[PDB]
């Protein structure tokens, strides 16, 4: 793209905390399957 400029880092690849995002997506799915959703 138009930007390629020096190092916006604090974005590496080594997670070490994969279960934390599992807790994130588990909370997301439990709010997704709640009694109230108010979709569409």
């Amino acid at each position: 793209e138009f930007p390629s400029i020096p190092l916006p880092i604090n974005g590496p690849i080594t997670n070490k905390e994969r279960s934390l995002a599992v807790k994130y997506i588990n909370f997301g799915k439990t709010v997704k399957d709640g009694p109230f959703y108010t979709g569409s």
Binding site: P3, S4, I5, P8, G11, P12, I13, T14
Partner: protein, 123 residues
């Protein structure tokens, strides 16, 4: 300008780091800095004309005998990137000694999709 400024900064930072902290306990973590200074004593000092003595111990062969103006200039140079300069001119290298060897930022970057740049193109 431009290399001898970095040379003088390197040697005065090395002298501060070897003056206010021991030598052989920086590159490893075996009871660090002798459990630093063995629950530190009342020593807690700095150079106070000793840094100009370490200057005088090794110089270039030219007009670089500076003191009392470039001394304060390098002092201001070392309290806007490093040493805090509390009274008694006390100097501690605790973060620059780690940066010379915010942590654990390895394995960067990727050649792929989003963040992994999120910079200008403003966001």
């Amino acid at each position: 300008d431009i290399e001898f400024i970095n040379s003088l900064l390197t040697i005065v930072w090395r002298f501060i780091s070897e003056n206010t902290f021991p030598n052989g306990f920086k590159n490893f973590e075996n009871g660090p800095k002798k459990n630093v200074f063995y629950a530190p004593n009342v020593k807690n000092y700095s150079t106070t004309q000793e840094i100009l003595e370490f200057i005088t111990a090794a110089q270039v062969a030219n007009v670089e005998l500076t003191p009392s103006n470039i001394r304060s200039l390098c002092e201001v140079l070392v309290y806007d990137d490093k040493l805090e300069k509390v009274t008694h001119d006390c100097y501690r290298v605790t973060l620059e000694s780690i940066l010379q060897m915010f942590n654990y930022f390895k394995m960067f970057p990727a050649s792929k999709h989003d963040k992994e740049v999120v910079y200008f193109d403003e966001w």
